[PDB]
Amino acid sequence: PCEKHSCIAVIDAGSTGSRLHIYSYDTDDTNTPIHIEEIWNKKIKPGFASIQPNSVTIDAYLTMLLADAPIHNIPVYFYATAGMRLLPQSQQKKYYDELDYWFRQQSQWQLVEAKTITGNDEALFDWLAVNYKLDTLKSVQNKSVGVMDMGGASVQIVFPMPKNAEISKHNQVELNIYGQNINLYVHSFLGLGQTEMSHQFLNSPSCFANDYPLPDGESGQGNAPSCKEEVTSLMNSVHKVNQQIQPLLALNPVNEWYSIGGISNLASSQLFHFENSELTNQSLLQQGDNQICHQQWDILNGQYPDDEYLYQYCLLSSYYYALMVDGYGINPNQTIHYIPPEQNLDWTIGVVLHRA
Amino acid sequence: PCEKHSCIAVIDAGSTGSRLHIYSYDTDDTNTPIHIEEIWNKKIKPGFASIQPNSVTIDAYLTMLLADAPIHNIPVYFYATAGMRLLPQSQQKKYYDELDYWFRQQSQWQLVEAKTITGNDEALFDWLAVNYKLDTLKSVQNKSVGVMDMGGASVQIVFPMPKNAEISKHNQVELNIYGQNINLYVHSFLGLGQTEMSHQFLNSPSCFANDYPLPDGESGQGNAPSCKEEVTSLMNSVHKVNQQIQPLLALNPVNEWYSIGGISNLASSQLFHFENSELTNQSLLQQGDNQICHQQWDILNGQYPDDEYLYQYCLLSSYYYALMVDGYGINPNQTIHYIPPEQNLDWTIGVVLHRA
Ligand SMILES: Nc1ncnc2c1ncn2[C@@H]1O[C@H](COP(=O)(O)NP(=O)(O)O)[C@@H](O)[C@H]1O
Numbered sequence A, B: 001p002c003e004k005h006s007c008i009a010v011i012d013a014g015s016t017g018s019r020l021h022i023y024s025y026d027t028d029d030t031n032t033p034i035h036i037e038e039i040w041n042k043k044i045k046p047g048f049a050s051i052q053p054n055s056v057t058i059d060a061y062l063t064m065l066l067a068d069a070p071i072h073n074i075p076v077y078f079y080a081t082a083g084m085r086l087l088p089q090s091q092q093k094k095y096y097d098e099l100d101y102w103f104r105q106q107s108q109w110q111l112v113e114a115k116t117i118t119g120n121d122e123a124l125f126d127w128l129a130v131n132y133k134l135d136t137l138k139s140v141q142n143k144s145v146g147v148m149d150m151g152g153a154s155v156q157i158v159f160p161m162p163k164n165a166e167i168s169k170h171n172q173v174e175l176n177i178y179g180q181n182i183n184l185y186v187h188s189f190l191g192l193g194q195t196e197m198s199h200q201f202l203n204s205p206s207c208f209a210n211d212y213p214l215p216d217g218e219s220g221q222g223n224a225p226s227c228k229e230e231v232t233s234l235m236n237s238v239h240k241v242n243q244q245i246q247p248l249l250a251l252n253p254v255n256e257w258y259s260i261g262g263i264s265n266l267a268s269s270q271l272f273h274f275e276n277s278e279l280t281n282q283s284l285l286q287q288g289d290n291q292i293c294h295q296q297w298d299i300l301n302g303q304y305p306d307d308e309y310l311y312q313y314c315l316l317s318s319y320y321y322a323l324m325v326d327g328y329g330i331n332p333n334q335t336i337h338y339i340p341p342e343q344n345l346d347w348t349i350g351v352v353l354h355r356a
């Protein structure tokens, strides 16, 4: 396919492992990629930021990730995300010095850039990947599309907003796609992703099903409004999510919301009932509260012994609600679309659109 | 030494690696260990909770940790701490099933117990290890000794307090050491340890030296009282540290405080000036504020290019203060002793005292 079309590789170096995507694409007369197709996809574990940063360890890791690919001589972007953002810069630099050397030693891959992207650039790529899949990029807008990424270490939110000199430059992006200028607000809250935030609530009985054993030896005694309130303290008293986001959304309303990341896995599970790949915050909290928070744990576990996230769904349903409703200000009745997990939508498509 | 005295092994399976300690000891006429001496000490990396939990990976890890030890046939305790507490129980159980099998396959080591200890038991062992080293356990008290452990994922606080039926049983321990009954309040805040809490503040410019590059691309603009206020929101609005701890300390004052864990490394560094292995919260914050928070980063880095924690000392000095003063209620002028890092005091001594 790379003889008939252009090709580009994007490595998503995320917190649990690194995923190489190779895409073929064509370019239309606005200089924008079209017909983007993933032609190779390889994941390896563990996360890059968890491995020893010396040449032997990096060489083994990059060789396992890359050496099997069926194409010589294509541009590659190596983009690490929140996993790496959590490491000191001095530690990060040891990985990049070794990685820069490794790429210089070979010619199959033409490294364009290797860096830890900001959460705001990740949010940009999220918005582009979603809108590409929905086919909303090509014609002149008319409805505002917002995207939320519920990631493992950081969460992103991104939505159209005219340029504003009162708002930091880091929270705004300007781009032109399919011939149209776009202005977006982007924000990422590092620490607020579902794995990192969970580490603050593991001994909260409000956040777990009844009788679930907490690490400190106490028992869950779930209640989603209570758990939601505890999560909302982290969101608003610490991260100031409400103060930062709600006034901007009031002034630049979003007509349609799409979410990606873990909410898609919860909402697609056997325990929750959602159709048309959408949910409302009201339904999500009511179903978490009734089905997990106030449910006897051993009984529930006996019934769904294979979903290893089951025991976490009182906390996650409470947290998604606390983030969207108490943090972002979204009405509990507002439809939120989620991208099905079995659709393999990936933010790296955004990198192809913006950088290829 | 194990022919002339009793011996016991304690494995501290912590978040960055596992450390085996083998101790020799004698027992006095109160049935309490005395003359406790570490005779072998082996550390391996990475943390147990980060390795693949299958037999090959666990066998390699345990063999590297244990197989070199110069003693056959002694009791061993395998105690994991907050690293493992952060994993779901179902994940933990995969490690323990493999570990139980591994010990059953050999006879050099007589596994007594392998488990993830609660933060409250860790606090008990902290208090015993410190007071053992200070030689305060042997005679009838008279001054109240409190211990704080500033650990990487959880923090512990522990101090004498008469039994109280209004307080949860999990937060109280009764023991008899050197013939005397002891009642202690123990508390552990999981998520509040310095590595986990830092992941909530990495994009806070108040928490870093001026011009230090934050992951989101903004620049540090340090101010310790500001950074302290942000940390205090996590401590009090989320973890309710003040509400839980201050009323109990008001009613059961501590005459002498000892801290262990990372505060010892900061306070022993080239940048801070502390003598007699003690500090006050007032001095700690004033020195962080002047020397790191409001200091130009590149200049400071040029001067101390070898302390890889240097860039974190505005945040850590602010956080220790927020925890002790705003959380626990300690007067900013009160002396806090810290156990020098070069003294190799280890909480596993507490396990010998309590369980050998
Ligand atoms: N059932 C679930 N509920 C909520 N979040 C869920 C979930 N299953 C996965 N996740 C979240 O999605 C992330 C990505 O899940 P996957 O990509 O499905 N698993 P892997 O690539 O790590 O093998 C997980 O790290 C977790 O944050």
Ligand SMILES: Nc1ncnc2c1ncn2[C@@H]1O[C@H](COP(=O)(O)NP(=O)(O)O)[C@@H](O)[C@H]1O
Pocket (backbone or CB within 6 Å): B016, B151, B152, B194, B195, B261, B262, B263, B265, B266, B269, B309, B316
């Ligand atoms: N200079 C420092 N300032 C504040 N905390 C410091 C520090 N140096 C280490 N630490 C803290 O102590 C912990 C234990 O440090 P060490 O035992 O000295 N290093 P290692 O055993 O991981 O090789 C670290 O994980 C970190 O939390």
Ligand SMILES: [Cl-]
Pocket (backbone or CB within 6 Å): A203, A215, A216, A217, B085, B117, B118, B119, B120, B188, B190
């Ligand atoms: Cl605990």
Ligand SMILES: [Cl-]
Pocket (backbone or CB within 6 Å): A286, A287, A290, A291
């Ligand atoms: Cl329901």
Ligand SMILES: [Cl-]
Pocket (backbone or CB within 6 Å): A085, A117, A118, A119, A120, A188, A190, B203, B215, B216, B217
């Ligand atoms: Cl960021």
Ligand SMILES: [Cl-]
Pocket (backbone or CB within 6 Å): B286, B287, B290, B291
């Ligand atoms: Cl000073």
Ligand SMILES: [Mg+2]
Pocket (backbone or CB within 6 Å): none
């Ligand atoms: Mg972690």
